[PDB]
């Protein structure tokens, strides 16, 4: 799988999996923005993650 040079580059699997879950949950409970264009869909959401992760990415 692709290894992007964004904030996931500094997180371990557990931490990345915690964040993947955050995003999936937010999508289900109505948070963020799902929009469509010519291309397809874009989902965007912002949040403050748990402190353990927040210290690492903030």
Chain-centre distance for alpha carbon 33:
13
Of the residues 3, 4, 5, 44, which one makes contact with Na ion according to CB under 5 A: 4
Contacts of 42 (CB under 8 A, 6+ apart): 33, 34, 35, 36
Query: Would you say 27 and 47 are in contact if contact means Cβ atoms under 8 Å apart?
Result: no
15 binds, among a second copy, Na ion, Cl ion, none (CB under 5 to 8 A by kind): none
In the bound complex, what is the minimum distance in angstroms from residue 47's beta carbon to Na ion?
4
Residue whose CB is less far from Cl ion, 17 or 32 = 32
Site residues (CB under 5 A) for Cl ion? Answer: 32, 45-46
């Amino acid at each position: 799988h692709h290894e992007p040079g964004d904030l996931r580059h500094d997180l371990n699997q557990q931490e990345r999996a915690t964040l993947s879950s955050n995003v999936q949950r937010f999508f289900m409970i109505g948070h963020g923005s799902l929009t469509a264009d010519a291309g397809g869909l874009t989902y965007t959401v912002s949040w403050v993650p748990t402190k353990q992760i927040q210290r690492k990415v903030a």
